[PDB]
């Protein structure tokens, strides 16, 4: 397939993969 894409199709091989304190007391848990 690499040969087919490059030798005669003359293009890059396609590759894919499925992909599956005060101020800061208010921000933090402590308050």
């Amino acid at each position: 397939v690499t040969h087919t894409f490059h030798q005669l199709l003359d293009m890059r091989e396609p590759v894919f993969e499925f992909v599956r304190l005060r101020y800061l007391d208010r921000y933090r848990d402590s308050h």
Partner: peptide, 22 residues
Amino acid sequence: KENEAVAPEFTNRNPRNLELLG
């Protein structure tokens, strides 16, 4: 080379593509 352009994502439609892949 213009041919070098490739799409970002494939469009595989085979029902058993994933099944055969596992």
